[PDB]
Structure formats: structure tokens, C-alpha cells
């Protein structure tokens, strides 16, 4: 017997690597019933035509798992949606590689979806660890009115309520606005000084421009942000000493491809040893039923903890995301980013580089009236 997995990649050269991966997959341990085949397609500028072709390749090849990826054209919001919606009808597992938005984390909507990189609303643990190590108890939250901001706010609120402590204030600003001075002026007259920002770059530029006018980003303050606000065009108005977070393998794709190939091969090896299985549906237009071993395949994929790969252990959690991902804490000095800390997954540790806090000087600012 043979089983074949499908891929939706945006580079022909990657197809050279991906094939090699399965060529390496059915070389370490094969030679009976596990003759893996690889079928690949390419991304389409149009979104409607993606589903027709995706179940056309489903029909022609009756694949078991689909490996999706992100294109270079930056919208990164609806690119894997047509594949996840169509493949979710038959409950065939689909695991992404370079997706970060938190809408796909909801298991109620996207029934069968797995991720390799942690979502955007998953770095609040880094902020909590930084607060613990630097001993900042009074914070000011400032988020945007959207799914990502609400999810991050909920996660941070739960994490802080685990300690029976709450944030001083929670500001919510309209995404894509043009006048911010009122809210920031209101937040200016308070007690806490630590300001945590989580929003998109386009409005992050407006937030920075508004804040820089009110003489509030001077000395004695502390700024913490995510990853989106550091990259992009929002670096023009970023004040000095703004602490930020970065993933250690956020852009590499060959490592993710090898990781996905290895974990899928291990899952299929562990699953094919059990009887009472049914082949995928034959055609996209054939019949409307449900895969018998869909949820079983999803469970056996979730329980699969990879031993060691190019990106470390690949142990999932009971959500569809990745656990124990390293982080790099970067401070920018004089418009230049330099890594100053590293977060293993449990507790962060610093490096041998004295940071420069906002407004110059070098101390350990605390923050209080």
C-alpha cells in the first residue's frame, strides 16, 4: 500500500527541498507498505479558485494530510483560509508552517488545523516573565479593537489573575483611526509607568507619533511591545529603549518543511499499525460524508512528540499550537537592534550588554508617582 501527502507551497525551489524531505522520509525506515508519494500545487493570486483546485488534487490523489504555507505578498490573513475551509469538510488534517494570526487557533471554527509556530497572542508569557524578573507590578494595557487584541488581553488578564492581581487600566483604541491624543492624554495622568502595546504596524506608527508629541516617552518610562510593532515601516517613529520580542526561526521555511515531513511520517507510521481504517473520500464532487479516522488521526498527531529535529522538540499542546519555543528579547539603541536577552520557555535570561532605557541613562527604572 501507498499513502501520499499534499503540499501547497509558493516556491518551486521549495518543491526541490520538500521532495528531498519525503525522499529522506522514506529512506530511514521504509521498504514495506509505506511508499510515500508527494503531490504539490502552487498558490494562486485569486482566492476563489484555490478551493476548486484543492479538492481537485484531493480527488486525484486522496491525500492524507496537507501542508500549507504563506506567500511573500503580505496579507497573511486569508491566504490559508480557502484550504482550511474546504479540507475541513472531510476532516483531513491540515497543518500550517508560517501562520501567526490567532483566529485560526479557535478549534470551533477551523475544525482540523495545526500550527508549527506559536500564534501572535501567545507571547504574553514573555511579558509576564519580564515583569517578574524586573519587578514591575503596575502596568498599563493598551490594545486595539480586534480579535488579536481581545485574545491577547484575555490571556494576559487570566495570567495576571492567577496571581490575584489586575492591571491598572485597559485602553482599547479603534483600529485604523486618525486621532489618538485624547486616549493617550487620559492615560498620561495615572500612577503606573509601564506601557504594553499590541496592535498593527500601520496604527502603531500613529500611536508612536501621537505619544512622541506629549513628552511622555521621555526619561523614567518603560515601553514593551510585541513583534509586529518592531518590524515594518513603524520603525521611523519608534523611541529609544523600546523592548521587543522576536522569534528565532520566524522566517526559515526549509526547517519547517523538514519538521512537518518528519512528524507526519512518524504519525502515519504509528497510525497504520492499527486496523479499522478507511481511505479518504475519492472525489471532491463524489459524495458528502465524513472520514472515519479523521479525529483519530488528529489525536495521534497531537500525541506525537518528536524526539529532536533542526528546530528542537515539536511537542504540541491540547490546542493545535506549538509549545516550548525560544524567544529573543531585543532592545534598539540609536536606531540599531541588538539582542540582549533570550527566553527558553520557562524563564528568561539576560546577556552581557547593559541596556539603554528610554530617554537615555542606564538604571533600573521602577515607575510610580
Amino acid at each position, epitope marked *: 500500500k501507498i499513502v501520499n501527502i499534499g503540499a501547497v507551497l509558493s516556491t518551486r525551489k521549495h518543491e526541490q527541498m520538500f521532495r528531498e524531505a519525503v525522499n529522506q522520509a522514506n529512506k530511514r525506515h521504509g521498504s514495506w507498505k509505506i511508499q510515500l508519494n508527494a503531490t504539490s500545487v502552487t498558490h494562486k493570486p485569486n482566492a476563489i479558485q484555490m478551493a476548486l483546485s484543492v479538492c481537485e488534487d484531493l480527488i486525484s490523489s486522496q491525500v492524507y494530510a496537507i501542508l500549507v504555507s504563506h506567500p511573500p505578498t503580505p496579507n497573511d490573513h486569508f491566504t490559508p483560509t480557502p484550504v482550511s475551509y474546504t479540507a475541513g469538510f472531510y476532516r483531513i488534517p491540515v497543518l500550517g508552517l508560517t501562520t501567526r494570526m490567532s483566529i485560526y487557533s479557535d478549534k470551533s471554527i477551523h475544525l482540523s488545523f495545526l500550527r508549527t509556530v506559536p500564534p501572535y497572542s501567545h507571547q504574553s508569557s514573555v511579558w509576564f516573565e519580564m515583569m517578574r524578573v524586573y519587578s514591575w507590578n503596575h502596568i498599563i494595557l493598551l490594545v486595539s479593537d480586534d480579535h488579536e487584541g481581545r485574545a491577547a488581553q484575555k490571556r494576559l488578564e487570566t495570567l495576571l489573575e492567577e496571581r490575584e492581581s489586575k492591571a491598572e487600566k485597559v485602553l482599547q483604541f479603534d483600529p485604523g483611526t486618525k486621532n489618538v491624543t485624547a486616549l493617550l492624554m487620559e492615560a498620561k495622568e495615572l500612577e503606573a509607568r509601564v506601557i504594553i502595546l499590541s496592535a498593527s504596524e500601520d496604527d502603531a506608527a500613529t500611536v508612536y507619533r501621537a505619544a512622541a508629541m506629549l513628552n511622555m516617552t521621555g526619561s523614567g518610562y518603560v515601553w514593551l511591545v510585541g513583534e509586529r510593532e518592531i518590524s*515594518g*515601516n513603524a*520603525l*521611523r*517613529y519608534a*523611541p*529609544d529603549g523600546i523592548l521587543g520580542l522576536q522569534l528565532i526561526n520566524g522566517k526559515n521555511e526549509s526547517a519547517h518543511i523538514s519538521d512537518a515531513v518528519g512528524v507526519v511520517a512518524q504519525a502515519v507510521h504509528e497510525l497504520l499499525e492499527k486496523e479499522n481504517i478507511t481511505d479518504p473520500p475519492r472525489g471532491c464532487v463524489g459524495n458528502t460524508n465524513i472520514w472515519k479516522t479523521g479525529p483519530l488521526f488528529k489525536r495521534v498527531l497531537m500525541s506525537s512528540k518528536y524526539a529532536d529535529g533542526v528546530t528542537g522538540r515539536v511537542e504540541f499542546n491540547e490546542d493545535g499550537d506549538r509549545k516550548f519555543a525560544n524567544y529573543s528579547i531585543m532592545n*534598539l*539603541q*540609536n*536606531r*540599531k*537592534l*541588538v539582542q540582549v536577552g533570550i527566553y527558553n520557555g520557562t524563564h528568561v535570561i539576560p546577556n552581557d*550588554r*547593559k541596556i*539603554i532605557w528610554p530617554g*537615555g*541613562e*542606564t538604571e533600573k527604572p521602577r515607575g510610580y508617582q
Partner: antibody
Amino acid sequence: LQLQESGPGLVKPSQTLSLTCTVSGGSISSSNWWSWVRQPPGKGLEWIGEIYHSGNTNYNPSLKSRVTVSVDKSKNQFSLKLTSVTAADTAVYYCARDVSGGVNWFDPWGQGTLVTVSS
Amino acid sequence: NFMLTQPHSVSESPGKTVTISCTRSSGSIASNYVQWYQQRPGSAPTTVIYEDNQRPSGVPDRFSGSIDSSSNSASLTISGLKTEDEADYYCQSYDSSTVVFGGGTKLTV
């Protein structure tokens, strides 16, 4: 605020070179940055590195592992310690102060010294 | 890291206007500022343009600049040329990793 440059002329090939730029009319302990830039004869301008007043440096990636910049605010002078020099390093060397700003802007540049490497 | 390309020398007659540009090769000049530096031979180079439209209070009002973001270029519109303008001009911009200068320009009368 004005900057003064002083270099020990030419140096022997494949040796260590040390320039000393002094600042008169201001205090090193401030919220600015101090940097070095060099220009080969009839060529472009290449940035070397910047050093903050207190503790930390930044270097050009091409020549990162050949420079150990230093400062001393007890006497208000910063020094360059280029090591493992080559034959094609003869250039005019400048010491320039750049404000903290939010932009990288060099003002005011020093007089500059001429540095030649040969035997 | 990247590189800046600008033409070498421009010919012009007194009493008119000329423009030169150092077009960015890799990336786009929209997330960083550009600065234009004067340089008289045998002298320390001095600032003539910063933030693309500022002017220090030591230079006569004959310089201006703009960014089009179409060909990724910046302008150095100079009006009312005189005999005290024969010098070399530089353009400089930064990024998130390093700071790089440009080439050269030999304005002639």
C-alpha cells in the same frame, strides 16, 4: 563645542594603530553618541563604529572583528584601536558626534588626520 | 545592508536649477530618513539637508528635497547657482543593521 583630532602619523605595516580624538567645549557625559568615519583617497565614505558614552559599542559587520573602540570620560577622550591592519587601509580618519535624536545625523565633524600605512 | 547609487558629476550653467538623486538599490526609502551632506575640499563636511526638508540656520535658502517612492529616489533641487557652490555632495541613510553612505558628485559651473 568643538572637536580636536590627533593621530600618531604613519604606522609600520601589519601593526596596531591608535588614534586619540579630544573634545573641548562640552562634556562627554551627555545623551549623544560619538563615532568614527574614514575616507580612502578618492573613494567613498565608510562608517566604522559608534560608542555610547557609558558602556556599549556598535560596529560595522564587514570589519566587526577588528576594532576595539574605547572611551575615557575622566579625561574626555575616546580612542580607536584598529588591529591586524592590512596594506590597503590608508585613509583620512574623522571623529564625529551624532545626536541621540531619533535619526542618525553627524554634526559637527572634526578637522581630521591623515593616516598612511607603509614601511 | 544595501548600496546607494548616484551619478558622478553634473554639468550646468550659472543662473538656473539642477537636480541630482541617489536612488536606493535594495529596499525602499520610506522607513528611513535621508540626509544630504556638503563637503568643501580640504575641509570638514557639513550638513546641508536633514529630514528631507529641514535646513540649519547657517545655509541660504537655495536647497530643497522630496521623496517620490516611485523610482526610490530623493531630490536636491538647487536654485540660483553661484561661484561658491563648486564642491562635492554626499547622501546618507541608515537602516536596522548599519549605516552606509553614497558615491560622489562633482558639480561644475
